[PDB]
Amino acid sequence: MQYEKVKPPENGEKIRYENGKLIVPDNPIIPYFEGDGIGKDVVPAAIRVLDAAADKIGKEVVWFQVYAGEDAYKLYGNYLPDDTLNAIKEFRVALKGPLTTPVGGGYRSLNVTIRQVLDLYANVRPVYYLKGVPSPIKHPEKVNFVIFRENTEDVYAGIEWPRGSEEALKLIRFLKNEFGVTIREDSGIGIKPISEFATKRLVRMAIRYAIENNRKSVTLVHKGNIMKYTEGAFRDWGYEVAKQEFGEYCITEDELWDKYGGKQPEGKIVVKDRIADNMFQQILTRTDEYDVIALPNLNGDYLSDAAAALIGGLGIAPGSNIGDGIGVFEPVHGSAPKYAGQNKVNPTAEILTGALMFEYIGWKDASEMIKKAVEMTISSGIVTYDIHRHMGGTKVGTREFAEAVVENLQSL
Amino acid sequence: MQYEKVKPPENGEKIRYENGKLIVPDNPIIPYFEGDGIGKDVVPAAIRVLDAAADKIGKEVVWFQVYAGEDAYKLYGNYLPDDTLNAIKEFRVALKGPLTTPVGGGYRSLNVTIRQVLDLYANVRPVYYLKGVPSPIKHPEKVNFVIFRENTEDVYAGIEWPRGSEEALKLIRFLKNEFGVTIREDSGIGIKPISEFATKRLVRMAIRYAIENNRKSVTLVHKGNIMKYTEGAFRDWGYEVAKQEFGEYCITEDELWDKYGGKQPEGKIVVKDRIADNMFQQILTRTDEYDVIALPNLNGDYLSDAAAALIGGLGIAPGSNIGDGIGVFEPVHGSAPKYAGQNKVNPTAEILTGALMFEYIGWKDASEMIKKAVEMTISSGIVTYDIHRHMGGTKVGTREFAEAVVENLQSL
Ligand SMILES: [Cl-]
Ligand SMILES: [Cl-]
Ligand SMILES: [Cl-]
Ligand SMILES: [Zn+2]
Numbered sequence: 105m106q107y108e109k110v111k112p113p114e115n116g117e118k119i120r121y122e123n124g125k126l127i128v129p130d131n132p133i134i135p136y137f138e139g140d141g142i143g144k145d146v147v148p149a150a151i152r153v154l155d156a157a158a159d160k161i162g163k164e165v166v167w168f169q170v171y172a173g174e175d176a177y178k179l180y181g182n183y184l185p186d187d188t189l190n191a192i193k194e195f196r197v198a199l200k201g202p203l204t205t206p207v208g209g210g211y212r213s214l215n216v217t218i219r220q221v222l223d224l225y226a227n228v229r230p231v232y233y234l235k236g237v238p239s240p241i242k243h244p245e246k247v248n249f250v251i252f253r254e255n256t257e258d259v260y261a262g263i264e265w266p267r268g269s270e271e272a273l274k275l276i277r278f279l280k281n282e283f284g285v286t287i288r289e290d291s292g293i294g295i296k297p298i299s300e301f302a303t304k305r306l307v308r309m310a311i312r313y314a315i316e317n318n319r320k321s322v323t324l325v326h327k328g329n330i331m332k333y334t335e336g337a338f339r340d341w342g343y344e345v346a347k348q349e350f351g352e353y354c355i356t357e358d359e360l361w362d363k364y365g366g367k368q369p370e371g372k373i374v375v376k377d378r379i380a381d382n383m384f385q386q387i388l389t390r391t392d393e394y395d396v397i398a399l400p401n402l403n404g405d406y407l408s409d410a411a412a413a414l415i416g417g418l419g420i421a422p423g424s425n426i427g428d429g430i431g432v433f434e435p436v437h438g439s440a441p442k443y444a445g446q447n448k449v450n451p452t453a454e455i456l457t458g459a460l461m462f463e464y465i466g467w468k469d470a471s472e473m474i475k476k477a478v479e480m481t482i483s484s485g486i487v488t489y490d491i492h493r494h495m496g497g498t499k500v501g502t503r504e505f506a507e508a509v510v511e512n513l514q515s516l
Numbered sequence: 517m518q519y520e521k522v523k524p525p526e527n528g529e530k531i532r533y534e535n536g537k538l539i540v541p542d543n544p545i546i547p548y549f550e551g552d553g554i555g556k557d558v559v560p561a562a563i564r565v566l567d568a569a570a571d572k573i574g575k576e577v578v579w580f581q582v583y584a585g586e587d588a589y590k591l592y593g594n595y596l597p598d599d600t601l602n603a604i605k606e607f608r609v610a611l612k613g614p615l616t617t618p619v620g621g622g623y624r625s626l627n628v629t630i631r632q633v634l635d636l637y638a639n640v641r642p643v644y645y646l647k648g649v650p651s652p653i654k655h656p657e658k659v660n661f662v663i664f665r666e667n668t669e670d671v672y673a674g675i676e677w678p679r680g681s682e683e684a685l686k687l688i689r690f691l692k693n694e695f696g697v698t699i700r701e702d703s704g705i706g707i708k709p710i711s712e713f714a715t716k717r718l719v720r721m722a723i724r725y726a727i728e729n730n731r732k733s734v735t736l737v738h739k740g741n742i743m744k745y746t747e748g749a750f751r752d753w754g755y756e757v758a759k760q761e762f763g764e765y766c767i768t769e770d771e772l773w774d775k776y777g778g779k780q781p782e783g784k785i786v787v788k789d790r791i792a793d794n795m796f797q798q799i800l801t802r803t804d805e806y807d808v809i810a811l812p813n814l815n816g817d818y819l820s821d822a823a824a825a826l827i828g829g830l831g832i833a834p835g836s837n838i839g840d841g842i843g844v845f846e847p848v849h850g851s852a853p854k855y856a857g858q859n860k861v862n863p864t865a866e867i868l869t870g871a872l873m874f875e876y877i878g879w880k881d882a883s884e885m886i887k888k889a890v891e892m893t894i895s896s897g898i899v900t901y902d903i904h905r906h907m908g909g910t911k912v913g914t915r916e917f918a919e920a921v922v923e924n925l926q927s928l
C-alpha cells in the first residue's frame with residue numbers, strides 16, 4: 105500500500121484472506137495505535153505481554169505503530185488519517201487503545217467511522233471469569249460466553265429527529281395520511297431498521313464460530329414477541345441460516361428433545377432462542393446453558409454489559425469489532441482523562457483483548473496462556489488500583505503489573 | 517354504573533378520587549378477579565392474607581367478584597366483559613390474577629386492552645429482598661427499588677412493518693427521498709416515538725411516589741448518548757419535571773455536592789440520571805445508591821426483569837399498572853395452566869401484589885405487615901415447592917402457605 109507519514113516495517117509478513125479463510129504467517133505485521141490518555145500506558149503493557157506469549161510458542165509479532173486521536177491531529181492535522189485506516193485495510197488485524205471524541209462529534213464517532221470504512225459488522229465479546237477478580241455473584245466461575253452483536257443497524261443507527269422539527273413533523277403527518285397511525289405531535293422520533301442481510305451475516309459468523317470452536321450451542325436473543333417484524337425477524341432469519349446453510353451441524357431445540365431424546369450428539373450444535381428481557385435472569389441462574397449468543401444491536405449491548413458485571417465489570421472487558429477477514433481489537437472501556445496520574449490504571453482489559461486478537465489469528469494456545477497468566481497474577485495479590493478495592497493491602501503500578509504477568513507466562 | 521351479569525356488594529363504600537387524591541374509607545369495595553389457571557389458587561390466598569392485615573389495622577375490604585378469561589367467556593361470551601372494566605372504573609382499584617391470552621390475538625392482549633381502555637400508563641414494580649429466598653448474588657438485602665416504566669410508547673407500541681410489505685417499502689423510500697437516509701429494502705421497520713406528554717406523566721408520578729414514601733432518589737435511565745432525540749429527550753423532560761414542578765424537593769447531583777457537601781438533607785430528593793446499559797453493573801455493585809427508578813418502556817422492562825433476577829426472580833414479583841387515581845394490581849407471572857387446582861403454586865407474588873395495592877390506598881402499615889409476614893414465613897423455611905427446590909424446608913401447599921403468613925401477621 106502507499107503510506108504517507110509512516111512506512112510499514114521491513115521485517116514483517118502480511119496476513120492474507122482468500123475464500124473466507126484467513127492465512128496467517130509466523131511473523132505477521134500487525135498495526136496498533138496507543139490512542140488517547142490511558143492508551144499510552146495500557147497498550148505498551150499489552151504489547152510486552154503479547155511479545156512474551158508470542159516468543160513462548162515460537163512465533164513473533166512485528167508491530168506497526170500507526171496513529172489516531174491527538175497524536176494524529178498533531179501529526180496529520182486529522183484525528184483518523186488515511187494511513188491508519190489503510191494499515192488495517194492492508195494488514196487486517198489491529199490492536200487499538202481507546203479514543204477521545206473531539207469537541208464537535210457524536211458519542212464514539214471515530215470508532216463509528218472505523219467500523220464503517222472497514223465494514224466491521226460484528227461486535228464480538230468474550231465473557232469469562234478469572235479467579236481472584238472480585239465478583240458480586242456467588243458463582244462467576246460458571247460464566248463462559250461469546251457474544252456476537254450485530255453492530256450496523258437497529259435503533260443505534262442514529263436515524264431519528266427531535267420533537268417539533270420539520271423532519272419529525274413530516275414523518276408523523278406522513279404516517280397519519282398514509283397508514284392511519286397516530287403519533288402524538290410533541291414526540292421525538294426514531295426508526296428501527298433490521299435487515300435480512302445484516303442479521304444473516306452476524307448469525308452466520310456466530311454459527312461458524314460455534315462449529316469451529318465446538319461450542320455446544322448458539323442462542324438467538326430477541327424481543328420478537330412484542331416486536332414481530334424487527335426482533336421477530338432476527339429470530340426467523342437466524343433460524344433460516346441454521347436450517348438452510350448449516351443443516352449438517354445445526355438442530356433446533358424441538359429437534360433436540362423429540363428426535364434426540366434430549367441427548368446432545370457429538371458434532372451437532374443446538375440453535376435456540378430466548379426472549380431478550382428474560383436473558384438477564386438466564387445468565388444468573390442457568391449460566392451453565394449458554395455458550396455462543398447472537399443478538400441485535402441494542403440487546404447485544406445490554407446483555408453483554410450485564411454479563412461483564414457478573415465477571416468483574418466492564419473495566420476489565422475485552423472487545424472486538426470484526427468483519428470479513430478483518431478485525432480491530434480494543435477494550436470495551438473509555439480513555440479516562442485523569443487516571444490518578446500516570447502508571448496507575450489497569451492494563452488487564454487491554455492485555456485480554458490482546459489475547460482475543462491471538463484467538464482470531466489462530467494462535468489460541470497463546471491466548472489461553474495469557475488468560476492463565478493474567479489469572480495467576482491477580483490471584484497472587486499483585487493488582488493495580490481498581491482490584492485493590494476488594495482485596496486491600498497489596499498495590500503495584502501499570503508497568504509493574506504487566507511485568508508480573510510476563511513473569512507468570514514464561515513460567516510454564 | 518350498570519352491571520349486566522353481576523352486582524356490586526351491599527355493604528361497602530367507593531374509594532373516591534378528588535383533587536389529586538384517593539379518598540379511601542375503612543370499608544372500600546375493591547373488585548378482583550381470579551383470572552386463568554393459577555389464578556383460582558393464588559388470588560384466594562392473597563385475599564386470606566389481605567383480610568387478616570386489614571382487620572388487624574381496623575379496616576375491611578368489601579370484595580367484588582368480577583370475571584375475565586375463560587370464566588368470563590363461559591359466563592358472558594366475552595373474555596373481558598363490560599362489567600369487569602366498569603367495576604374497575606367505578607371502584608378505582610382492583611386486584612387480578614393472570615390471564616392467558618386466548619388462541620391468536622394482540623399478545624399479552626387481555627392485559628393490554630385493560631390498560632388501554634382504563635388508560636393505565638405506568639407500570640410500577642417494587643423490587644426488594646425477602647430473607648430466605650434463594651439469590652444468585654452476594655448482597656441481596658441491599659436491593660430496594662421501585663421501578664416506574666412508561667408503558668404506552670417506545671418500540672413496544674408496535675408501530676412496525678414487515679420486510680418488503682408495501683407499507684415498509686413506502687416508508688423506506690420516503691426516508692431516502694425526503695431525509696437522505698438510505699435504509700436497506702430487505703429491512704423490517706419499526707418506529708420509536710417518545711413524547712413530552714407520556715414522559716412527564718411517568719416522571720411526575722415517580723417523583724410524587726418518592727416524596728410520599730421518603731425515598732432518597734429518582735434515577736432517570738436512558739441511552740441518550742446514542743439516541744439523542746428519543747431517550748435523550750426522556751432524560752431532559754424528566755429533569756424539566758424535577759426542576760419546574762418539584763423545585764422545593766429535587767436537587768441534582770451537582771447541587772448535592774455544591775450545596776450540601778455530599779450529605780443529603782432529609783426531605784431533599786436527589787434526581788440523577790444514568791446510561792441504561794451501565795445500569796446492570798450499577799444495580800449489582802452500587803445497589804444501595806438506587807431507589808426510585810424512572811425509565812421508558814423497553815429499558816423499564818429489561819431493567820426491572822434484571823432486578824427481579826437479583827432477588828429471587830420473576831416468579832415472586834409483585835406488579836402494578838397505574839393511571840390517574842386508578843390502579844390494577846397483578847403479579848408479574850403468567851397463569852401456568854399445568855398446575856391449575858393442585859394447591860401447589862407459590863402465592864407470594866399475589867400476596868405481595870395485595871401489599872402493593874394496600875400502599876396505593878394509603879394503608880402503608882398493613883402493607884409493611886404483609887411483607888414482614890411473608891419473610892418470617894419463608895425464613896422459617898415454610899415454603900411452597902418452588903423455593904423448596906433450592907432451599908429445602910417444609911414443602912407446603914398454597915393454602916397452608918397463606919395460613920402461615922396469617923399466623924405470622926397476627927404475632928406482630
Ligand atoms: Cl459501552
Ligand atoms: Cl359484554
Ligand atoms: Cl415479562
Ligand atoms: Zn460456584
Ligand SMILES: [Zn+2]
Nearest residue numbers: 300301304702
Ligand atoms: Zn433471503
Ligand SMILES: [Zn+2]
Nearest residue numbers: 340341344348
Ligand atoms: Zn426465507
Ligand SMILES: [Zn+2]
Nearest residue numbers: 405406409793
Ligand atoms: Zn454498553
Ligand SMILES: [Zn+2]
Nearest residue numbers: 447501503504
Ligand atoms: Zn513504578
Ligand SMILES: [Zn+2]
Nearest residue numbers: 541542574575
Ligand atoms: Zn377507622
Ligand SMILES: [Zn+2]
Nearest residue numbers: 290712753756
Ligand atoms: Zn416543554
Ligand SMILES: [Zn+2]
Nearest residue numbers: 381817818821
Ligand atoms: Zn419483561
Ligand SMILES: [Zn+2]
Nearest residue numbers: 908909910911
Ligand atoms: Zn422438606
